[PDB]
């Protein structure tokens, strides 16, 4: 996160750490949506242009963290994966259309003061909150600066949702309905963005009708970090909701 701040303890108890078994190292972010289900971005797991092709067995999931490097004794939980699922129609070839994936944990995780899941939007919530100028929040343990160091604890930043055409006019990549872009314009004064290491993370919103936190997006792609005139792209969770409902229904929860 670029231009963010230090997250308070217990501020995003759904946040999750994709951790590389060996070399032991952080991979991406993700989030707790149930006691057995993690949600991330397909590109975190698979990206052939780079030989990125992970397995159930290649990685570790850590939940309840604040500190990036330290092994948080008696606070953090570590789990293992049972099965991995990617959207069948995920477009790794062109523009990351449908960058989304589901992960099922070996054993279900127990909730605590530092561990709790988020909600998934409904057509209405989604309709009502998913609007331009409305702010959402991003979290993660990724880089603090585009090129250079790294953060000590989870970082946070709130951004505004931008209008389709602006997004579109911001780049040469072919954009689909399963995306949205976020951030400040240049005439705005304020800055901030995600960066390397934030991917797969959660972009969220708080409902003003019932007070809950919903996951509207997954950190997908972008060009640079907090470059002026640039925005971050997010997978449109709602639009892919049916796929998720399925796999969850079909695979046990």
């Amino acid at each position: 996160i670029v231009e963010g701040s230090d997250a308070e303890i217990g501020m995003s108890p759904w946040q999750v750490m994709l951790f590389r078994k060996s070399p032991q190292e952080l991979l991406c972010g993700a989030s707790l949506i149930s006691d057995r289900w993690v949600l991330t971005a397909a590109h975190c797991l698979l990206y052939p242009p780079w030989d990125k092709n992970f397995t159930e067995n290649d990685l570790l999931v850590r939940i309840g963290k604040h500190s990036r490097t330290r092994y948080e004794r008696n606070i953090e939980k570590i789990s293992m994966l049972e099965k991995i699922y990617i959207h069948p129609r995920y477009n790794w070839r062109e523009n990351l259309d449908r960058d989304i994936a589901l992960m099922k944990l070996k054993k279900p995780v127990a909730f605590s003061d530092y561990i709790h899941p988020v909600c998934l939007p409904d057509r209405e919530t989604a309709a009502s909150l998913l609007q331009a100028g409305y702010k959402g929040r991003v979290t993660g343990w990724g880089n603090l600066k585009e090129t250079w160091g790294q953060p000590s604890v989870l970082q946070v930043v709130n951004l505004p949702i931008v209008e389709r055409p602006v997004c579109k006019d911001s780049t040469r990549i072919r954009i689909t309905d399963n995306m949205f872009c976020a951030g400040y314009k240049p005439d705005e004064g304020k800055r901030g963005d995600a960066c390397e290491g934030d991917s797969g993370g959660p972009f969220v919103m708080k409902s003003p009708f019932n007070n809950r936190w919903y996951q509207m997006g997954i950190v997908s792609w972008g060009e640079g970090c907090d470059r002026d005139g640039k925005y971050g792209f997010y997978t449109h969770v709602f639009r892919l909701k049916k796929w998720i409902q399925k796999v969850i229904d079909q695979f046990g929860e």
Binding site: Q24, L60, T69, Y71, M80, C195, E196, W221, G222
Partner: peptide, 14 residues
Amino acid sequence: XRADYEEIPAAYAX
């Protein structure tokens, strides 16, 4: 894509 860790106790490494 935008175009030093403390050890973990093996007990977890399946």
